Amino acid sequence: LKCNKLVPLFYKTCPAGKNLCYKMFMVSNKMVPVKRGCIDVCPKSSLLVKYVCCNTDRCN
């Protein structure tokens, strides 16, 4: 929740019922979380972008 919305503003609070702290889980070049941050689109898997949601404020 208090969480990296983008990156270099690292960890602070998120509005309302925007629940888990998301991130664009690219595996390929290195594990490169692209965009991190609160929003709500969380689960599924594409391919270049699964997402690793996390409810404990720190995985980001």
Side-chain angles (χ1 to χ4, degrees), residues 3-36:
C3 285
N4 297 38
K5 164 174 356 70
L6 206 83
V7 182
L9 313 174
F10 358 72
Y11 67 105
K12 287 108 196 99
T13 338
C14 286
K18 306 280 103 257
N19 295 290
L20 276 69
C21 296
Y22 125 131
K23 60 208 58 66
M24 300 196 82
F25 193 66
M26 285 181 173
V27 198
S28 319
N29 57 337
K30 274 164 193 167
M31 301 298 163
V32 152
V34 207
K35 298 179 184 170
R36 273 149 279 201

